[PDB]
Amino acid sequence: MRNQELARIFEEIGLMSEFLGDNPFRVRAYHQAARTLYDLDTPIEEIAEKGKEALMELPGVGPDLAEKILEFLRTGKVRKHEELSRKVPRGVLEVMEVPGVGPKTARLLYEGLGIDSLEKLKAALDRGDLTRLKGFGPKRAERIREGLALAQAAGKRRPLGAVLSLARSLLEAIRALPGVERAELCGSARRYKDTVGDLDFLVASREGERAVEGFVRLPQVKEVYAKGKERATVFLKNGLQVDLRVVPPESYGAGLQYLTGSKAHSIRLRALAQEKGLKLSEYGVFRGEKRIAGETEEEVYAALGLPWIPPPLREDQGEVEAALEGRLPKLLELPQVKGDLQVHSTYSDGQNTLEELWEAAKTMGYRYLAVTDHSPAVRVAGGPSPEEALKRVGEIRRFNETHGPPYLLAGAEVDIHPDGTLDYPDWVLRELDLVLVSVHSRFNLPKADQTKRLLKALENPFVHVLAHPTARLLGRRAPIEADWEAVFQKAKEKGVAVEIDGYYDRMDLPDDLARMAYGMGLWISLSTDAHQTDHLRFMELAVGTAQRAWIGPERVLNTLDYEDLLSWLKARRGV
Numbered sequence: 001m002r003n004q005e006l007a008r009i010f011e012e013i014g015l016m017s018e019f020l021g022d023n024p025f026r027v028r029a030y031h032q033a034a035r036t037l038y039d040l041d042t043p044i045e046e047i048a049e050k051g052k053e054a055l056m057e058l059p060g061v062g063p064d065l066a067e068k069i070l071e072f073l074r075t076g077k078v079r080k081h082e083e084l085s086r087k088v089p090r091g092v093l094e095v096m097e098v099p100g101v102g103p104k105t106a107r108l109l110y111e112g113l114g115i116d117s118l119e120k121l122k123a124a125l126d127r128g129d130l131t132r133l134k135g136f137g138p139k140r141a142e143r144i145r146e147g148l149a150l151a152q153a154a155g156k157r158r159p160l161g162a163v164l165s166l167a168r169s170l171l172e173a174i175r176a177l178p179g180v181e182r183a184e185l186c187g188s189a190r191r192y193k194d195t196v197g198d199l200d201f202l203v204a205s206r207e208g209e210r211a212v213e214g215f216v217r218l219p220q221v222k223e224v225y226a227k228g229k230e231r232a233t234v235f236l237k238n239g240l241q242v243d244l245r246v247v248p249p250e251s252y253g254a255g256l257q258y259l260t261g262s263k264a265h266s267i268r269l270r271a272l273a274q275e276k277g278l279k280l281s282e283y284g285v286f287r288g289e290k291r292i293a294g295e296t297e298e299e300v301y302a303a304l305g306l307p308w309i310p311p312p313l314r315e316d317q318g319e320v321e322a323a324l325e326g327r328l329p330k331l332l333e334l335p336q337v338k339g340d341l342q343v344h345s346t347y348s349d350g351q352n353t354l355e356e357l358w359e360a361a362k363t364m365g366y367r368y369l370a371v372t373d374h375s376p377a378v379r380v381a382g383g384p385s386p387e388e389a390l391k392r393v394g395e396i397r398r399f400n401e402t403h404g405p406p407y408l409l410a411g412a413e414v415d416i417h418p419d420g421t422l423d424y425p426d427w428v429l430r431e432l433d434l435v436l437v438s439v440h441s442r443f444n445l446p447k448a449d450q451t452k453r454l455l456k457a458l459e460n461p462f463v464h465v466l467a468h469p470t471a472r473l474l475g476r477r478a479p480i481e482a483d484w485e486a487v488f489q490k491a492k493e494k495g496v497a498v499e500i501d502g503y504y505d506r507m508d509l510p511d512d513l514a515r516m517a518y519g520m521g522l523w524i525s526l527s528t529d530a531h532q533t534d535h536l537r538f539m540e541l542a543v544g545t546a547q548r549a550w551i552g553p554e555r556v557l558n559t560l561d562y563e564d565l566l567s568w569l570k571a572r573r574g575v
């Protein structure tokens with residue numbers, strides 16, 4: 001549908017018209033036309049095909065607006081919008097849309113102060129320039145500052161794990177609204193994409209307009225950006241940008257599919273529907289006018305002749321073909337994970353004692369946890385020395401002797417030197433239960449030198465896992481450049497697993513490289529890189545990444561029980 005695109009065009013025309021001082025009657029009309037298009041559920045094109053008079057049946061649409069709708073549908077543009085855009089720069093439009101600014105203020109700011117961008121606006125805010133204008137006091141100034149921050153965040157993405165728990169807190173409040181029967185966090189978050197834009201929630205309600213009203217008045221809500229009969233966009237006090245859509249309970253499953261996407265996956269499903277005489281919309285699966293499915297997501301897939309497809313697969317990257325042939329991949333599931341294979345302690349830079357790690361693992365129902373403290377070069381420190389590392393192995397063994405399961409694996413995260421040698425000697429490595437190796441320095445070696453360094457590390461016969469291989473930090477450091485085919489092939493041949501480190505700003509291996517590694521036949525190790533017990537919750541992110549990468553429980557170290565894991569670690573591995 002082009003409804004939302006057209007709603008935006010009319011809204012912008014309204015904003016620009018007011019900036020330019022057009023008739024307030026015309027300004028208000030464009031905003032009413034925008035609301036009508038925003039609220040309209042049926043495709044605008046379907047009413048336009050019925051003619052100009054039918055378009056005029058819509059609330060707010062007169063002869064002028066009807067011709068513009070037809071113009072948009074026939075040409076893809078609206079000349080008036082193009083005309084006003086010539087008079088109103090992109091930066092000034094951005095300024096006027098900041099909550100608390102608006103078009104007439106933006107005009108004064110443009111003419112009088114020279115503000116034609118968010119940049120100048122922020123400069124003016126920060127210096128107190130705006131305080132010398134009428135109608136500007138602390139309440140409005142604060143609204144504008146915050147509005148600017150929300151504007152500047154709108155294109156950007158955050159790590160999934162930075163926002164998932166916050167999104168779930170909002171989900172609890174949405175579910176608790178009287179009138180809401182079911183709700184779910186959808187969009188790219190439900191697909192476990194490692195960075196997310198806005199957050200999208202679907203609600204089932206028989207009273208959708210009233211559900212929207214309850215939603216926008218939740219204690220968590222700071223600013224309402226858009227609101228209508230069945231949808232809203234808000235910003236929370238905590239800064240999260242959130243879209244809500246409401247559907248009737250009979251449509252909930254179709255709404256879940258719609259709001260989860262991806263867009264590419266939904267395109268595939270809509271074609272499959274029409275090819276068998278059905279229509280898939282947000283509201284259901286229909287044969288002619290008859291709704292034949294919609295209440296549950298599995299029912300919707302079934303009506304299209306498909307098994308239910310897990311959200312992390314919904315990227316149009318082979319899952320539709322696999323579903324059509326009744327051969328969806330087996331996927332790793334969170335209950336199959338028997339432990340976390342990279343956690344840190346007070347022996348190095350973790351906050352927790354062995355007792356505290358053990359207690360947390362026991363709560364989680366794990367069989368084991370690998371305590372993998374850093375070698376000295378990781379910490380940019382003097383220790384722990386090789387002698388201390390071995391003393392620690394004995395202490396972890398005594399801890400197991402006195403505690404029992406979940407068993408602690410005595411491990412280390414061993415730095416790879418620039419030349420590919422390792423930061424502990426083999427007499428330490430041979431005694432560790434679990435040897436991880438990783439890059440923590442010289443991130444910008446030429447690709448061929450970084451590759452040689454990693455290959456040399458993988459030659460050491462005591463290594464078990466290549467930890468967080470790219471070393472990326474979301475928002476801070478790009479992945480290292482290396483020939484991952486060469487690295488992964490050597491790891492496979494040597495029997496070294498690659499890690500999916502689900503720590504929220506690592507997410508490393510990323511899904512795409514994990515998909516490559518698993519497809520090449522490697523073993524996989526999941527971890528959270530925990531430095532406090534609250535980080536252990538990130539295992540779900542590592543599992544979601546595995547699902548996106550089509551990874552099953554086969555060749556995942558964490559699905560082995562303790563005895564089988566120790567056997568794997570001690571075995572002659574590789575070719």
Ligand SMILES: Nc1nc2c(ncn2[C@H]2C[C@H](O)[C@@H](COP(=O)(O)OP(=O)(O)OP(=O)(O)O)O2)c(=O)[nH]1
Pocket residue numbers: 186187188189193195196197198199200258259260261262263266
């Ligand atoms: N990208 C996109 N998605 C659409 C469109 N129409 C419907 N959808 C559905 C499928 C999307 O997964 C879902 C949510 O839209 P969003 O734009 O919020 O995208 P999504 O959450 O998938 O990714 P994001 O992390 O927000 O970039 O809505 C469209 O025109 N574009």
Ligand SMILES: [Ca+2]
Pocket residue numbers: 055056057058059060061062
């Ligand atoms: Ca009308």
Ligand SMILES: [Ca+2]
Pocket residue numbers: 175176177178179180181
């Ligand atoms: Ca409720």
Ligand SMILES: [Ca+2]
Pocket residue numbers: 187188197198199200
């Ligand atoms: Ca989204």
Ligand SMILES: [Ca+2]
Pocket residue numbers: 187198199200243
């Ligand atoms: Ca959205």
Ligand SMILES: [Cl-]
Pocket residue numbers: 252253256295296297298
């Ligand atoms: Cl469902």
Ligand SMILES: [Zn+2]
Pocket residue numbers: 344349350374531
């Ligand atoms: Zn650390």
Ligand SMILES: [Zn+2]
Pocket residue numbers: 413438440467468
């Ligand atoms: Zn590390």
